Amino acid sequence: GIVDECCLRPCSVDVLLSYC
Amino acid sequence: QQPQAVHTYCGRHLARTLADLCWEAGVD
């Protein structure tokens, strides 16, 4: 779950862009 | 009132996000 990655800590685009 | 810095979301809003990015990756 990416939730415990964006909620808990950053995940600014340069990090979410990696989930896709 | 709607940026994307530390105002991270939590559950669900995360499902619509990769659906918004994978979107800019290939709206096809």
Q: Which DSSP string corresponds to A3-20?
A: HHHHTSS--TTTTTTTT-
d(C-alpha B14, C-alpha A8), whole Å:
13
Q: Please tell me the experimental approach by which this structure was elucidated.
A: NMR
d(C-alpha A10, C-alpha A20), whole Å:
16
d(C-alpha B2, C-alpha B28), whole Å:
26
Among candidates B6, B11, B21 on the partner chain, residue whose Cβ is nearest the Cβ of A16:
B21
DSSP state of B9: -
Q: A17: nearest CA in chain B? A: B21
For chain A, report the end-to-end CA distance as a whole number of angstroms: 13
Residue of A6, A11, A19 to mutate, interface with B, max B Cβ within 10 Å = A6
With H, G, I as helix, E, B as strand and everything else as coil, classify residue A1.
coil
Which residue in the block uniquely carries the two structure tokens 């415990």?
Answer: A4
Interface touch B5/A11, C-beta < 8 Å: no
CB B17 within 8 A of CB A5: no
Query: Burial code of B1-28, b = ≥16 C-beta within 10 A, e = fewer?
Result: eeeeeeebbeeeebeebeeeeeeeeeee
